[PDB]
Structure formats: C-alpha cells, structure tokens
C-alpha cells in the first residue's frame, strides 16, 4: 500500500528545505496525490478539511476532523509523531492551519489539487494569498527515486503483456466495448492491482481523442487506437498506446503512419539530461511538419507520470524546463483525421544520466491483424 | 443521463440573474457537480482547463481543449449555442476566460470544486480574486426541483429495499466484507445504476466513523452499523443508515439506543420552512444531552444531498440558514463508544411547505437479528 516510513521522513525533510529555500512559511497539503507522496495517506475527507501543514522549519501538523482520527494509523503520520489538531463540526479548521504556521500573516504554497472550497477561506485565515506548491514539490516528485522507477518499469512490462493479448481481441463484428472488457480483465490478470483506463478507438473513433469505447463494431479496414493503463503497487501508472490495423492498411495510411513512427522515435532519441521539454516536443513535431502532417498533431507530445497518470513535467511547446535524470513522462505523438482514422504511438520513458530508458517495448510498427 | 435541455436553459438564466444580483461579472465553473447541474456535462479534463463562463449578462462561453471538442454534443452546451473557445497545448486558457468576461479586471465567483491549479492562475488573469460561487449557486441547487425530489425519492425507496435484505446477510462468522459484497450487489439489483458506498461497522468498528468494511467476522452480540447508498438516474443519491443487533442486545445498549431514536425523531419533527439548520441540529443534540450522551455524538446532525452525497445545506451548530421547501439533507445523529459499539439512525428528508417528507422509511428501532 505504501513505502517504509523512512521514505516519507526523507520526503518531508526535503519538502521543508525547499519551502524554506523558496522563502515561504510552509506548505498546506489537502488530500490527493501530494499527500500520498508526502506521508502515504489515501485519506480523502471532502468538504471537511484534512491538511498536512509542513512548516519551513519545525514539526509538521495534521489538521483533521476528530471523527477521522483512526485514519492516522493508516499512513506514516502516527509513526513520525506529527502534531495532531483534530476539530469538531462547528469549528473553523482554517484557523488551526494558520496557528500551526505560527499564525497570520503566513505566506504559503498549496497543493495544486486543493479545491476553492478550502483555498479561498484558507487565504483569509492566512492573511496572505497562497501560491502553488508545484514549483516546490516538483523538485521532489518529478524526479523518481529508484523504487518509483522500479514500479513504473514493472507496470510498463505488465501493460506490454496486455498489448500482446490485444490482437486476438480484434475480430471484425466484436464491439469496442467487448474488446475493452477483455483488455480490462487482462490488465488485472497481468499484475496491475487495478485498471486505470481503456481506450479502444476504431475507424472514425480513432480520430477522436475524447473517445473511450462504445458499441461500434470492428470492421475490416479499421485502424484501431488502443491506449491503456493500470496501477502497480503502491500506486504507479502504466500508460501505453499502440495502433493496429484489421487487415492490410492502404498505402497512404501506411506511409503517414511511418512518419508518425519516425516522429515518435526522434522524440525518444532527443531525451537526455539538459535538453528542454520544448525541444523534445519539437523533435516529434518537426518530423511531422516535414511530412506535411503537423496540423493533424493536435496535442502535446507527452505528460509526466507517477502516482497520477498526468503530472509534471509536461512535454509541450513553451516548456523551457531542462530535463534531469529520473524524470518520467510519456512520448505520444499522434495524427488525427476527423471522420476517417487516427494513430498514436505512446511509450513511457525515464530519463537516465546519458539518455532515456523506455519501460514500454512493444513493436512501434502498425501491427497488421489478419481478418 | 441528463435532463431535457430546457431544464438547463432555465438553470443557466437563474444562475446568471443571481450572479448579477451579487454584483459579479460572472461565474467560472470547471468540471464537477456544479457543471453537471448547470449544463449536464460529465466532462472532466484535469490539468487542462475546461470551464463554463457564465456572465452576469450575455451569452455563456465554454473554454476547453480543442482535443475535447466532441464532448459538446454530450451535454446541453451544443443545443443552447453557447460560444466555444477551444485552445491548443501551448496556449494559456486563463486569458480566454478573462476575455469571455469582458477582459481583466473581472470580479467573479468560482465553483467550490475548482482546484488551486486553475484558481490561482485564473485569479492573476482576472485581475481580481474570485469569491466562492456557493452563495450564488446554493439558491439554485439546494432547492430541489420536482424532478430532483422524485429521483431522490426513488433512490430512497430503492435503498430501503436493500436494508430489508440486510438482516439475512448478518450471520455470525461472515466477514463485514462478505456482507458488503452482498449489499453492493443488492444496491444495483434494487434499481440504482451504481453503488455509492457501503459501510458495515460491526462490534468495535461501529464506534469508528472512518470505517468502511474489513475482514472482521460478525459475532453474536455485535451491534452492526449499516450505512449505504447508490445513485439513481440522472445521478441523485440515496444515503441511509440503520443499526442491527445480532441477537438480543443488553439492557444498557437498548436504553441508550432508544435515546438516539428519540433524538433522530425530534430532529425530523423540527424540520419546517423557517427553522434554522442550527435549530435542527439542536433538536437531536438536546435529547442526547438530556440522556447524558452528547459527548458521544461526535459529528453534525446531517448534510445536504443531491447530485453529490454531501452538499448544501449543512445541518450543524452555527449554521443560521433558514430552511426552505425543497431542501434535501440527511438527519443522522449517532452515538459512538470507542472500542465497544456505535449506532446511527439516518434518513434523507425533503422540506415541504409545512414540514418534511422522509424518503427513507425503514423501522427506526434497533432491528434484532436472531442468531
Ligand atoms: Zn463529505
Ligand atoms: Zn503536538
Ligand atoms: Zn501536485
Ligand atoms: Zn461513433
Ligand atoms: Zn475527454
Ligand atoms: Zn499518456
Ligand atoms: Zn495513454
Ligand atoms: Zn521500436
Ligand atoms: Zn520497430
Ligand atoms: Zn490530465
Ligand atoms: Zn460565439
Ligand atoms: Zn459547488
Ligand atoms: Zn478492526
Ligand atoms: Zn474517512
Ligand atoms: Zn449521510
Ligand atoms: Zn450515510
Ligand atoms: Zn420510525
Ligand atoms: Zn418505529
């Protein structure tokens, strides 16, 4: 479910140090993925405030409902002896957060997931508008530790084993939803503790990035986009797309697809410490430009992945962030032809000291499933 | 899945009028339950901004990723011809929100679910710190329309049918989790389109409000707290708790439980237009005080319910909101004895012109299941 307490003790210290280096009095983390990362808590109260208050200096405090007290034994909080301030319905828990930071006025950063419901009254209680914690917690969470790389690698190998099972699911007459049920079951069977998402976009639906699956039946000649992932304990994601053709594709489809393959490969080959996120997006986008296809490449090249399917860093135009070793993100260019077909090639890669490691290794060619 | 477009046209106009009456330039609704209520959208992009921009005056605008364009046909947005501003990865969509409101500086309110990720850059783009939309949208969403009352009533009758099936699940030796699987299946069978939550707190776990279910086996003498709900199309919740005893309880348990029953009944009897939320909480809390039990009543008396299990109004100490007809909330006092047992009696009620209608009607007595 979670890492040893020592892992969290070390994340908490590193987070406090970076908060101090950013000149803030502290961080305020309500439930979600930053909390899970910082103390291993899967708590989520919703309208009732639970928050980890991590001062730049001194002992952290957990503010939470008294009725939730037993949740402390679940995460690392109890073992580390963080201060607890439980409150009862009728209390203003925002005042407890202020006090745990030394009292208003206090300059803080908040987890980017904190809802307005809490953020706006927190701002009043603190006397200072919070800034996003993303610049602070980024330095930690986007640089994966050895054990996190390992979990992503095992999730990647597992999702690869699912993609190997996909061609036998792709039979004319079967609906996208029957394929998706077969895939969901295989996601679990191959070792993920849960299904994250299943996308099976056949024929025209492959051109539609919002599409999940439906009752459309596979036809001979369909290009089928398959984008799938699961979680691997203690909660890291796989996320890989491969495109299949039901019977031989046409020459035009084959040629444009192979430009996409070159684009994807070239973005993967550009991954090194020191190159910018925007340079990696440029590497895919330039090849597709040169083949005359850039207008059909309607999204960013990739997103970070870890405890969430989508996180820092973003491999997108305008992102000047230099890449460093241990960053994990997708490389997933695609081309989309509204009403006709689409294709996407997606790997998760991990930055190494002199390049990248792909944790997804299925063939990159368009797989031709016989009819 | 959703209401006729006319229902949303009317919610949008009423929301605009209240926004103007509050002196704001407009509302900004990112994905979640306010969006579902306002235009019937189940969209959720996450780190990419989707927002309904509802000016105090003039046509609303949807700001969303170009890659999500097809989602517009899913909700009422396309039928009502709202303006669309799609944007591409690399763009700052917060600038589009500002412009749709006439440009910075713009004073707005935001859905209480909006995450910091969007709220903090939105605040900069708008030139003015947003306030919570809860005071505006409250006037709409906490007053249920006839069709919403109907959906809650059908969900309530369905969850009652589940509670009727619960005694036969409660057999010594069976684990809480096996009971919970039986309940989850019955939730669907009785007509809910999905399970919302299943709580089976037996023996000591009944004293623990954070508890869901576990591998603890039911024992003779256990008091079992059962708190369960599902959704009913187009997405309204049931939420009802009843307490069971495995074989006759002891005289002390029986006596204290009947004080809880009186407390619950007295909060239900106090529900009328014009009484305050805090007076309704007082009605339950005073009876439990008088029996000497108030210190074991460790939470608010109830919460609003509708498209979410937890919403406005909150039936809690300090809430001065006068109740009006069509409000829907739980009445759910409980008493908790750490390490020993707990009990909770929970109904959803709807305020009527001269009182309340309960949509949950299972017996309020402690049900004694034979061993
Ligand atoms: Zn809640
Ligand atoms: Zn302390
Ligand atoms: Zn974050
Ligand atoms: Zn279709
Ligand atoms: Zn979508
Ligand atoms: Zn991806
Ligand atoms: Zn993907
Ligand atoms: Zn290859
Ligand atoms: Zn190859
Ligand atoms: Zn996302
Ligand atoms: Zn327009
Ligand atoms: Zn709301
Ligand atoms: Zn236990
Ligand atoms: Zn809880
Ligand atoms: Zn409830
Ligand atoms: Zn309940
Ligand atoms: Zn009764
Ligand atoms: Zn009775």
Closest by CA to A216, choosing from A268, A249, A172, A279, is A172
Q: Which residue has the tokens 């003790």?
A: A9
Q: Is A47 annotated as a binding residue?
A: yes
Count of C-beta atoms within a 10 Å radius of residue A219: 12
Q: Which residue has the tokens 């040169």?
A: A290
Q: Where are the beta strands (DSSP E) in chain B?
A: 26-29, 51-55, 61-65, 83-87, 108-110, 131-132, 194-202, 223-232, 236-237, 240-246, 302-304, 311-315, 328-331, 334-337, 341-344, 347-352, 355-358, 367-369
Chain B hits for A208, CB-CB cut-off 8 Å, are 70
**Residues B132 and B112: beta-carbon distance below 8 Å:** yes
Q: How far apart are CA B151 and CA B164, in angstroms?
A: 20
Q: What is the CA radius of gyration of chain A?
A: 23
Q: How far apart are CA B359 and CA B161, in angstroms?
A: 12
Cβ–Cβ of B116/A120 closer than 8 Å? no
Q: How far apart are CA B161 and CA B249, in angstroms?
A: 24
User: Which chain B residue's Cα is nearest to A299?
Assistant: B89
Closest by CA to A156, choosing from A323, A300, A349, A302, is A349
Closest by CA to A189, choosing from A159, A215, A209, is A159
Closest by CA to B180, choosing from B223, B209, B213, is B213
Q: How far apart are CA B328 and CA B308, in angstroms?
A: 11
**Residues A190 and A158: beta-carbon distance below 8 Å:** yes
Q: Is B211 annotated as a binding residue?
A: no
Chain A hits for B300, CB-CB cut-off 8 Å, are 89-90
Structure letter (DSSP) for residue B25: S
Assign residue A137 a region (left: φ > 0; alpha: ψ between -120 and 50; beta: otherwise): alpha
User: Which chain A residue's Cα is nearest to B72?
Assistant: A210
CB nearest to B310's CB, from A46, A119, A120: A46
Q: Which residues contact B6 (CB under 8 A, 6 or more apart)?
A: none
Task: Tell me the residue length of chain A.
Answer: 371
**Residues B48 and A316: beta-carbon distance below 8 Å:** no
Which CATH topology does B1-140 take? Creatine Amidinohydrolase; Chain A, domain 1 (3.40.350)
**Residues B213 and B199: beta-carbon distance below 8 Å:** yes
Instruction: Please check whether residue A204 touches B, CB under 8 A.
Output: no
Chain B hits for A130, CB-CB cut-off 8 Å, are 116, 120
User: Which chain B residue's Cα is nearest to A335?
Assistant: B67
Give the number of beta-carbon pairs within 8 Å between A and B.
100
Q: How far apart are CA B55 and CA B100, in angstroms?
A: 8
User: Which chain A residue's Cα is nearest to B134?
Assistant: A117
Instruction: Please check whether residue B131 touches A, CB under 8 A.
Output: yes
- How far does B174 lie from chain A, in Å, by closest CA? 24
User: Which chain B residue's Cα is nearest to A70?
Assistant: B210
Q: How far apart are CA A241 and CA B340, in angstroms?
A: 52
Q: At what angle do helices A251-270 and A277-290 cross, to 10 degrees?
A: 160
End-to-end CA distance of chain B: 43
Count of C-beta atoms within a 10 Å radius of residue A215: 8
Residue A240 class from Cβ within 10 Å (0-12 exposed, 13-18 middle, 19+ buried)?
buried
**Residues A220, A173, A371: CA angle, nearest 5 degrees:** 35
Measured in angstroms, how far is the CA atom of residue B10 from the centroid of ligand 16?
A: 31
Instruction: Please check whether residue A138 touches B, CB under 8 A.
Output: no
End-to-end CA distance of chain A: 43
CB nearest to A114's CB, from B67, B116, B210: B116
Chain A hits for B71, CB-CB cut-off 8 Å, are 210
Closest by CA to A40, choosing from A326, A327, A234, A192, is A234
Q: Which residues contact B258 (CB under 8 A, 6 or more apart)?
A: B366
C-alpha dist (Å) from residue A18 to A23, A54, A134, A249, B39? 9, 11, 11, 53, 42
Closest by CA to A362, choosing from A186, A160, A190, A187, is A160
Q: Is B190 annotated as a binding residue?
A: no
Q: Is B271 helix (H, G, I), strand (E, B) or coil?
A: coil
- How far does A317 lie from chain B, in Å, by closest CA? 5
Instruction: Tell me phi and psi for residue B225, to 5 degrees.
Output: -90, 125
Measured in angstroms, how far is the CA atom of residue A340 from the centroid of ligand 4?
A: 11
Q: Which residues contact B141 (CB under 8 A, 6 or more apart)?
A: B34, B37, B306, B307, B311, B312
Resolution (A): 2.2
Q: Is A347 annotated as a binding residue?
A: no
Instruction: Tell me phi and psi for residue A347, to 5 degrees.
Output: -120, 150
Q: Is A182 annotated as a binding residue?
A: no
Measured in angstroms, how far is the CA atom of residue B143 from the centroid of ligand 17?
A: 26
| CA within 13 Å, CB half, A205 | 22
User: Which chain B residue's Cα is nearest to A90?
Assistant: B317
Closest by CA to A199, choosing from A218, A217, A214, A221, is A214
Cβ–Cβ of B66/A298 closer than 8 Å? yes
Q: How far apart are CA B75 and CA B54, in angstroms?
A: 16
Closest by CA to A223, choosing from A346, A299, A335, is A335
Assign residue A318 a region (left: φ > 0; alpha: ψ between -120 and 50; beta: otherwise): left
Q: Output the CA torsion A304→A305→A306→A311 (10° steps).
A: 50
Measured in angstroms, how far is the CA atom of residue A38 from the centroid of ligand 9?
A: 39
Structure tokens at B160: 């009652």
Q: Is B178 helix (H, G, I), strand (E, B) or coil?
A: helix
Count of C-beta atoms within a 10 Å radius of residue B182: 19
Q: How far apart are CA A26 and CA B126, in angstroms?
A: 26
**Residues A260 and A288: beta-carbon distance below 8 Å:** yes
Q: Which residues of B246-273 are buried (b: 16+ CB within 10 A; e: fewer)?
A: beebeeebeebbebbbbbbbbbbebbbb
User: Which chain B residue's Cα is nearest to A319?
Assistant: B90
Q: Is A83 annotated as a binding residue?
A: yes
**Residues A273, A277, A282: CA angle, nearest 5 degrees:** 115
Q: At what angle do helices A93-100 and A116-126 cross, to 10 degrees?
A: 50
- How far does A71 lie from chain B, in Å, by closest CA? 7
**Could you tell me the maximum CA-CA distance found in chain B, to the nearest angstrom?**
69
Query: Domain segments of chain B: what residues?
Result: 1-140, 141-371
Measured in angstroms, how far is the CA atom of residue B143 from the centroid of ligand 12?
A: 13
What sign results for the dihedral spanned by CA atoms B314, B315, B316, B319?
A: positive
Assign residue B326 a region (left: φ > 0; alpha: ψ between -120 and 50; beta: otherwise): left
Q: Which residue has the tokens 């204290």?
A: B256
Count of C-beta atoms within a 10 Å radius of residue B57: 11
**Residues B80 and A83: beta-carbon distance below 8 Å:** no
3-state SS of chain A is CCCCHHHHHHHHHHHHHHHHHCCCCEEEECCCHHHHHHHCCCCCCCCCCCEEEEECCCCCEEEEEHHHHHHHHCCCCCCCCCEEEEECECECHHHHHHHHCCCCCCCEEECCCCEHHHHHHHHHHHCCCCEECHHHHHHHHCCCCHHHHHHHHHHHHHHHHHHHHHHHHCCCCCEHHHHHHHHHHHHHHCCCCEEEEEEEEEHHHHHCCCCCCCCCECCCCCEEEEEEEEEECCCEECCEEEEEEECCCCHHHHHHHHHHHHHHHHHHHHCCCCCEHHHHHHHHHHHHHHCCCHHHCCCCCEEECCCCCCEEEEECCCCCCECCCCCEEEECCEEEECCCEEEECEEEEEEECCEEEECCCCCCCCEEECC
Chain B hits for A300, CB-CB cut-off 8 Å, are 89-90
Structure tokens at B327: 């409000």
Interface test with B, best of A72, A87, A89, A110 (most B CBs within 10 A): A89
Instruction: Please check whether residue A41 touches B, CB under 8 A.
Output: no
Instruction: Tell me phi and psi for residue A154, to 5 degrees.
Output: -70, -40
Span A141-371 CATH architecture:
Alpha-Beta Complex (3.90)
Q: At what angle do helices A146-169 and A176-189 cross, to 10 degrees?
A: 140
Q: How far apart are CA B97 and CA B99, in angstroms?
A: 6
Q: How far apart are CA A143 and CA A119, in angstroms?
A: 27
Interface test with A, best of B1, B51, B89, B114 (most A CBs within 10 A): B89
Q: Which residues contact A241 (CB under 8 A, 6 or more apart)?
A: A199, A225, A226, A227, A228, A332, A334, A344, A345, A346
Cβ–Cβ of B115/A117 closer than 8 Å? no
Q: Which residue has the tokens 């930071």?
A: A101
Q: How far apart are CA B77 and CA A328, in angstroms?
A: 37
Q: Which residues contact A239 (CB under 8 A, 6 or more apart)?
A: A159, A196, A227, A228, A229, A305, A309, A330, A346, A348
Cβ–Cβ of B88/A46 closer than 8 Å? no
Distance of alpha carbon A223 from the chain centroid: 26
Which residues of B, range 155-194, sit inside 8 Å of A by Cβ? none
**Residues B181 and B195: beta-carbon distance below 8 Å:** no
Q: At what angle do helices B176-189 and B146-169 cross, to 10 degrees?
A: 140
Structure tokens at B317: 């100490």
Instruction: Please check whether residue A56 touches B, CB under 8 A.
Output: no
- Please give the method by which this entry was determined: X-ray
Q: Is A160 annotated as a binding residue?
A: no
CB nearest to A71's CB, from B115, B120, B210: B210
Cβ–Cβ of A89/B316 closer than 8 Å? yes
Instruction: Please report which helix (H) or strand (E) contains residue B21, including its range.
Output: helix B5-21
Structure tokens at B185: 């299946």
Structure tokens at B14: 């009423």
């Amino acid at each position: 479910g979670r890492f040893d307490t020592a892992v969290y003790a070390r994340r908490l210290a590193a987070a406090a140090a970076a908060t101090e280096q950013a000149g803030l009095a502290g961080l305020v983390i309500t439930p979600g993925y930053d909390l899970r990362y910082l103390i291993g808590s899967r708590a989520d109260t919703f309208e009732r405030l639970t928050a980890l208050v991590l001062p730049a200096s001194g002992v952290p405090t957990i503010v939470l409902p008294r009725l939730e007290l037993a949740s402390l034994k679940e995460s690392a909080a109890s073992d580390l002896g963080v201060c607890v301030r439980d409150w009862v319905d009728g209390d203003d828990p925002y005042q407890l957060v202020a006090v745990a930071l030394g009292g208003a006025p206090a300059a803080t950063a908040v987890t980017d997931s904190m809802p307005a419901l809490h953020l706006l009254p927190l701002a009043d209680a603190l006397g200072v508008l919070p800034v996003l914690a993303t610049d602070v917690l980024r330095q930690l969470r986007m640089v994966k530790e050895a054990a996190e790389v390992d979990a992503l690698a095992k999730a990647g190998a597992a999702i690869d084993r699912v993609h190997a099972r996909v061609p036998a699911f792709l039979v004319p007459g079967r609906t996208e939803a029957q394929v998706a049920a077969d895939i969901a079951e295989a996601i679990v069977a191959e070792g993920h503790s849960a299904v994250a998402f299943v996308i099976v976009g056949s024929g025209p639906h492959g051109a539609d990035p919002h599409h999940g699956y439906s009752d459309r039946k596979l036809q001979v000649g369909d290009i089928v986009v398959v984008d799938i992932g699961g979680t691997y304990e203690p909660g890291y994601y796989s996320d890989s797309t491969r495109t299949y053709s039901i019977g031989d594709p046409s020459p035009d489809v084959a040629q444009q697809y192979s430009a996409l393959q070159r684009a994807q490969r070239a973005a993967v080959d550009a991954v090194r410490p020191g190159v910018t996120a925007a340079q990696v997006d440029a590497a895919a986008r330039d090849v597709l430009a040169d083949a005359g296809l850039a207008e059909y490449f309607v999204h960013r090249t990739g997103h970070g992945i870890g405890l969430c399917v989508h996180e820092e860093p973003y491999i997108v135009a305008g992102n000047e962030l230099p890449l460093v070793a241990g960053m994990a993100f997708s490389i997933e260019p695609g081309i989309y032809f509204p009403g006709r077909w689409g294709a996407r090639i997606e790997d998760i890669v991990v930055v190494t000291e002199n390049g990248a490691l792909s944790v997804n290794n299925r063939p990159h060619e368009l797989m031709v499933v016989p009819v």
